[PDB]
Amino acid sequence: DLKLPRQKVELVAPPFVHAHEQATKQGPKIVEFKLTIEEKKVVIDEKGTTFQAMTFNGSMPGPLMVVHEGDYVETTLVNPATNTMPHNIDFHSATGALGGGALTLINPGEQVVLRWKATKTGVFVYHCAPGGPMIPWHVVSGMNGAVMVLPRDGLNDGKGHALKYDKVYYVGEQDMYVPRDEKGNFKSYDSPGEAFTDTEEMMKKLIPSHVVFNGKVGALTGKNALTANVGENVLIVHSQANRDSRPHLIGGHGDYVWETGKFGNAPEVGLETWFIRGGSAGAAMYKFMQPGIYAYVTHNLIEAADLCATAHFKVEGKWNDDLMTQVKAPAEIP
Amino acid sequence: DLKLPRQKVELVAPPFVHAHEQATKQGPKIVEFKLTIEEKKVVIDEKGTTFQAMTFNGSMPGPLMVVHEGDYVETTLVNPATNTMPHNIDFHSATGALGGGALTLINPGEQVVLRWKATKTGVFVYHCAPGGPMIPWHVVSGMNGAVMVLPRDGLNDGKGHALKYDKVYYVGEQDMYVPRDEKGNFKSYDSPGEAFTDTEEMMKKLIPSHVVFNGKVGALTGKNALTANVGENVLIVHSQANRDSRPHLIGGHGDYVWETGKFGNAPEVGLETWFIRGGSAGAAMYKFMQPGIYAYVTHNLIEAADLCATAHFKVEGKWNDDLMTQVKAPAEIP
Amino acid sequence: DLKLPRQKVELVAPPFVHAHEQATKQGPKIVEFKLTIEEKKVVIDEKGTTFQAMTFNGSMPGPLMVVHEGDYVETTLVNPATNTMPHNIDFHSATGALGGGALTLINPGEQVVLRWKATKTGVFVYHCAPGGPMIPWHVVSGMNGAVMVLPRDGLNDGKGHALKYDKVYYVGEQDMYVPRDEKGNFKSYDSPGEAFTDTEEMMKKLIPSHVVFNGKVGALTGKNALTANVGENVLIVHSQANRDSRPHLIGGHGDYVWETGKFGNAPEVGLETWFIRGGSAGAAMYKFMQPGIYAYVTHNLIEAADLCATAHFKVEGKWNDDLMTQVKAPAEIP
């Protein structure tokens, strides 16, 4: 008996985000999404380390879902028979039934349809949570993503001024726990089930072997660097479903940052580094002022440089010598 | 020569909180509390692991003390002769003498009486701190609690509106360090002194064996689940005296959150997950909208599901299908 | 063609800060600083453990640079031929070229001059970042400091009132990774290069052996305790270039705290413990109310008491019995 218009969304793989309006004149609708779970062995680093991943829609992170406050989000969650485990979905944006987890447990070969009303604005984690010790295991295996619930009037700075982004990227950060054998090489496994005992043992010690963006070391570099132009306002949504992170744009700032990720709160301004609490998403916007390469990292630099947690931006435009200039290039000391 | 009325409080064990007013028409009083230190061997998990605990009033955490801004808090701290170690108390709410620690060092068989003026509003940690390496050891052995200093007009949202809670719970989170023997079983000790060398060695490696609420795995589940009804506004005070935490109510939100815990600051609104800095208390209020079971966790889900850090709420009332509904129950994929 | 007045600054070693104005009637100037890199073996604890340090200006942290919004900061970075490695500098306060890192890479025997416009207010990290895995290694070897960019009208409370400090201290916190040999003693190395392989192995495990202020256990105690008088407002700038911290003044508070460190945001009030995200600086001001000794710690008390992260303040003045009093000294229990 919920008589509103229905709108289908075609999700796109991260770090890109499906097309959407910021401010809208649409009223509430039932926005329809489909997520199909895929368990798969993937490569996570440039050395060829493999990993028993569990994913929504084939990606780590799962895709970003975007709706507006007061929309109803109707998700068909599909667990094909080619998977081995039960799965479900918990939306941190939703109210009741463990975020939906208690209404969405599906065995291989099943699907379920959950609807929730988007009553809270912000960016939020979604993740699998089948019960007990399986909860962390599915999450750290990759079964997490995010959903953005925009105000119908779009974003604002808390001081009456609209904040409109020219583009948005979703960076999902994943702590991974890959065991090593006696001589110190990473182990490979034939199935997630086979990976579980060694993986849980390592998980409980709370030190990841890898911390990656978009599912692999280097995922958001080279051909797949993020991009912008001088003058463009870019929103960067960052999530971490299990473990804290401290994002930083090297050579830039967070002009407007919602580190707790919730648009009912005004953004902070002019940050160097912000903090994503494990189990949350946050967002930062920056207007690029200088061309060139930037790195986007977690600012535990050991994690960034040595465990995988670095993305790049390639930015086009004109250099601004007022903001920064090399007065004297490297030369012998007099 | 401090000539104000005296009021005794009968403390109650966590997660419950002694009776108190939110807004009050009372002026300042001298509010009298007694804390009696107990060292004791306790069971911390469902496997029967034992732990050399050190407690205020027999509990982990120590009980929540509640006063109003401008009250004087007069604590009789008692260290019975049946204990083995010196102890003291540091109130993060207090000004001077290391929070009181420098005025309250008592050997077994002694007591001391400290008064401090409640000039800062919020929730605050209190903990033992006898000196040097004993400081962390006593804290991580359980010797910590919290004190709430309310505004005399009660809580507000920073926008002129009163925030009144229907009930309050105190969740004290404890990082514990229980060593293992060569084959990998947790060790048991005959006294705290005997536990110290192995425990310190483990402590310095900064990875707990257990992270619990209310002193044990499962403490706030089953018979001892937290409770609410749909429509009730519940305040959840969360403390962690030594290590960070990231609280999250699964299936709910933080409607109003003071993550740094201090009522001179407006609350943030509509959070998914908040952050308790080690060495602090914070508070979150939520009005329940849906019946059923909720889990309240730290959202490092490894800690929550595998190391002990999960509580439950059981909530009574009517399900709201507008907020959430299972449109199609699990079924075979077409 | 940048035609502004030039002003030289003589930097001073932490925890002290070079002389500067808070509010100023000066307009923009080119403020000139020199940093000379020194690699050196130092002692980091009272047991005589040694450490292959890499420093700006000989200190850990590097010195605090202080300017005003809209100044241009012109740094001559010098890498003497007596050093072994290339080095550079990344200012989190600066815009473009990886914070300056991409314009300042200098081999031993070279210097470079970088200018950047101080368009963002707050306290910010600066650090070396030569590329790749060298980034974390140089940072955790000591190559980090901070720069404070004040509003030209000085600090304010966000409610229209000026906040003027009577003194400022800079506490730089350093996570250090010193490997151990088979029997468990800390290793010593003949050069940073020789320390690298064992040090990187340890770094990737994300547990420091030492967490210190001002470069060594006990650096800011005894003769070198911080000082104040009752009635003095002290600003404490705290930085951590790689790893989170949770500052706390034992026996005091943070009266006004910018935990994310950026003066475009109002301070929070009345904190017990605040949070410095790794890769940032923050600042807290406190007006002392009581004489005596205070400890300033990270409130992971294991880190504070056992790994090195404790400073002291010695405060002169008159005790205030209204704020705190020992009603009854320790005595036998009746």
Ligand SMILES: OC[C@H]1O[C@@](CO)(O[C@H]2O[C@H](CO)[C@@H](O)[C@H](O)[C@H]2O)[C@@H](O)[C@@H]1O
């Ligand atoms: O940015 C959110 C922040 O801004 C304030 C105004 O200071 O409210 C603005 O944003 C609200 C949510 O979008 C709007 O409903 C409101 O009309 C607008 O002024 C704060 O109240 C809020 O915390």
Ligand SMILES: OC[C@H]1O[C@@](CO)(O[C@H]2O[C@H](CO)[C@@H](O)[C@H](O)[C@H]2O)[C@@H](O)[C@@H]1O
């Ligand atoms: O919620 C605290 C926050 O609210 C403001 C008003 O925006 O002040 C309110 O709360 C103060 C502390 O309880 C009251 O003294 C004040 O009268 C009331 O308006 C902020 O100033 C404060 O940060």
Ligand SMILES: OC[C@H]1O[C@@](CO)(O[C@H]2O[C@H](CO)[C@@H](O)[C@H](O)[C@H]2O)[C@@H](O)[C@@H]1O
């Ligand atoms: O403390 C910064 C905070 O204060 C406000 C007023 O609430 O602005 C003050 O500080 C600004 C930066 O120094 C000044 O430009 C402004 O004039 C002054 O009122 C906030 O806007 C700001 O977030």
Ligand SMILES: O=N[O-]
């Ligand atoms: O070689 N086994 O881990």
Ligand SMILES: O=N[O-]
């Ligand atoms: O500035 N970042 O390493």
Ligand SMILES: O=N[O-]
């Ligand atoms: O290249 N030396 O000035």
Ligand SMILES: O=N[O-]
């Ligand atoms: O068996 N000793 O730890």
Ligand SMILES: O=N[O-]
């Ligand atoms: O939603 N919590 O795992």
Ligand SMILES: O=N[O-]
């Ligand atoms: O039960 N299958 O539709």
Ligand SMILES: O=N[O-]
């Ligand atoms: O003794 N070698 O580490």
Ligand SMILES: O=N[O-]
């Ligand atoms: O109050 N500090 O340990």
Ligand SMILES: O=N[O-]
């Ligand atoms: O010293 N005993 O009261």
Ligand SMILES: [Cu+2]
């Ligand atoms: Cu799953």
Ligand SMILES: [Cu+2]
């Ligand atoms: Cu969750």
Ligand SMILES: [Cu+2]
């Ligand atoms: Cu004690």
Ligand SMILES: [Cu+2]
């Ligand atoms: Cu403390």
